[PDB]
């Protein structure tokens, strides 16, 4: 059931990275977007955000979201999560790091809830193009028409087709830890943490410790506060500094792997044939730019392939050998002459 995914549900931690276009400039958003994969057909997009969707801190859920504000995972009800493109999208399902959504064509993808007192959105420059499966360069999945073996991402989550790495988090920096006691700087740890003390003054440079204080140095701006939180693990993101140790294992299954489904494809209007002596007058009234392919059935193929968008009349020389033409997604047909 839902709770049979503890590996990603329990062990993962929402990490924060450097969104390129966080609102006005590049801030450090908790929803730093990574690995946009718009490689499907019908226009479904898989986005690997830096926030962890679905699971409340308290084991598991789905109506909740876990994002990291500060040193703590301030989880909330997911409520107004946007997934934007040239036009706003409509998300399908969300699972931990990944969120599957269907978008209209565009050149930018932006993600963001709006926690209410603050927005915390993020975008990234990445073109998204949607080629419908078939011979007709349509734009949106139509109500009716024939169906073809398309490829897209399943809405299902309980799959293990592919895996991704997840190791110990790196030494996250946090300046707010370097408080002072009016005589020397005081370090602090919230709970179970083991911070690292480093300062410019000639002193103990290593400073690995629980709650403790500096030896001699006094200038906060002349120190470093690195934080260790190895109790949880994070995704191997390219915007986060590597931990100095071992690549901790644990394969997080990819929630939405591509599958070979069936999409509804458009159906071009039927051509109006008009026979002529050893000549096939073909009246065409395309609705959207559709491929037209024809080939002679004789010894010489004599291929002809050309996209047609504006309604036009084309003619072909149908010899006694015979001729074949495939208009749009219609099944191929054949013809004689006298």
């Amino acid at each position, epitope marked *: 059931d839902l709770d049979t995914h503890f590996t990603q549900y329990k062990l993962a931690r929402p990490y924060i990275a450097d969104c390129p276009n966080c609102g006005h400039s590049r801030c450090d958003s908790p929803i730093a977007i990574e690995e946009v994969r718009g490689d499907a057909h019908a226009g479904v997009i898989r986005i690997q955000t830096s926030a962890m969707f679905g699971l409340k801190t308290d084991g598991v859920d789905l109506a909740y979201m876990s994002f990291m504000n500060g040193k703590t995972q301030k989880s909330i009800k997911i409520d107004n999560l946007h997934v934007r493109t040239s036009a706003p999208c409509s998300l399908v399902s969300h699972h931990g790091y990944y969120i599957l959504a269907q978008c209209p064509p565009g050149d930018t993808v932006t993600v963001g809830f709006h926690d209410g007192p603050n927005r915390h959105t993020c975008t990234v420059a990445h073109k998204v193009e949607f080629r419908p499966v078939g011979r007709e360069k349509y734009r949106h999945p139509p109500e009716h028409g024939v169906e073809l073996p398309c490829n897209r991402y399943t809405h299902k989550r309980a799959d293990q087709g592919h895996y991704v790495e997840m190791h*110990q988090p790196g030494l996250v920096a946090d300046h707010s830890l370097l408080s002072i006691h009016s005589a020397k700087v005081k370090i602090t740890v919230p709970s179970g943490a*083991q911070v690292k003390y480093y300062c410019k003054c000639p002193d*103990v440079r*290593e*400073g*690995i*410790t*629980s*709650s*403790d*204080h500096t*030896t001699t140095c006094t200038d906060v701006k002349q120190c470093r506060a690195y934080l*260790i939180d*190895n109790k949880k693990w994070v995704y191997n993101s390219g915007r986060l500094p590597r*931990g*100095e*140790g*071992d690549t901790f294992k644990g394969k997080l299954h990819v929630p939405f792997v591509p599958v070979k489904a069936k999409c509804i494809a458009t159906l071009a209007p039927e051509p109006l044939v008009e026979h002529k002596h050893r000549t096939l007058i073909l009246h065409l009234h395309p609705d959207h730019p559709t491929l037209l392919t024809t080939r002679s059935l004789g010894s010489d193929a004599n291929p002809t392939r050309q996209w047609i968008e504006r309604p036009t009349t084309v003619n072909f020389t149908v010899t006694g050998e015979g001729l074949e033409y495939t208009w749009g997604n219609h099944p191929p047909k054949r013809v004689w002459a006298q």
Partner: antibody
Framework: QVQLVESGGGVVQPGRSLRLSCAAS????????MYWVRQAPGKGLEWVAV????????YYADSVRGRLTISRDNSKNTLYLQMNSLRAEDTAVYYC??????????????????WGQGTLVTVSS | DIQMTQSPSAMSASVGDRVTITCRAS??????LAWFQQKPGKVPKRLIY???SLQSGVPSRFSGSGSGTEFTLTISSLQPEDFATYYC?????????FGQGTKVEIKR
């Protein structure tokens, strides 16, 4: 059974160098933190140094910093202490030790459970 | 650096006595501290860790208390095998200094 076996102790002149070794067996040596502790004749214990499972971090008491170098060879299950510029104050039994046999990258809270019998270093002319 | 101060440096006690050894850190070490017994000519043996976790296989007569800067080893009823030198160790930071050791001798 977990064993640690120190070797390379002996008599050395002041200002000379000596290399201690500690062979390990009965546990996954390459996964655990290793420590040197010394005890001068008739004195209390003194913490000398520590090295991580990978050797990537190394720490030293201020009394030995710049003169002693801790190292390891995980392929040989062997810990080393290179001692340079030895002084009469470095005369001690040196003990090889580890925490309980459970692993970590740059973390430990089981300090000093398994130890060797120690090797005597005498620094004298 | 951190320094560990043990009090007393030596004490005389009888079999059956309650022995209390105090260790003070020069800076806070939370509860990342351990206690070690050493008999003459032997290797040290750990008795307590985390300032109160009794080591597996060590007698229930040993007990530990304190947090932050002040810590203790309490032997509830001193046995003939307990006459030894006792060390505290802080393990919160590296370097990890031992205390000077407290020698428990037989009172006569």
């Amino acid at each position: 059974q977990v064993q640690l076996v120190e070797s390379g102790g002996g008599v050395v002149q002041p200002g000379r160098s000596l290399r201690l070794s500690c062979a390990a067996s009965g546990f996954t040596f390459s996964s655990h933190v290793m420590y040197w502790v010394r005890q001068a004749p008739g004195k209390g214990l003194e913490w000398v140094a520590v090295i991580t499972y990978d050797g990537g971090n190394k720490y030293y008491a201020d009394s030995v910093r710049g003169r002693l170098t801790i190292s390891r060879d995980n392929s040989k299950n062997t810990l080393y202490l290179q001692m340079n510029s030895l002084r009469a104050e470095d005369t001690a039994v040196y003990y090889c030790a580890s925490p309980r046999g459970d692993s970590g990258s740059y973390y430990d809270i089981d300090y000093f459970d398994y130890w060797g019998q120690g090797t005597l270093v005498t620094v004298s002319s | 650096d951190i320094q560990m101060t043990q009090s007393p440096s030596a004490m005389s006690a009888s079999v059956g006595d309650r022995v209390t050894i105090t260790c003070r850190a020069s800076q806070g070490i939370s509860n990342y501290l351990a206690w070690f017994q050493q008999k003459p000519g032997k290797v040290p043996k750990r008795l307590i860790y985390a300032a109160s976790s009794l080591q597996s296989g060590v007698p229930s007569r040993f007990s530990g208390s304190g947090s932050g800067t002040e810590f203790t080893l309490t032997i509830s009823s001193l046995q003939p095998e307990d006459f030894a030198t006792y060390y505290c160790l802080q393990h919160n930071t590296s370097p990890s200094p031992f205390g000077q050791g407290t020698k428990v001798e037989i009172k006569r």
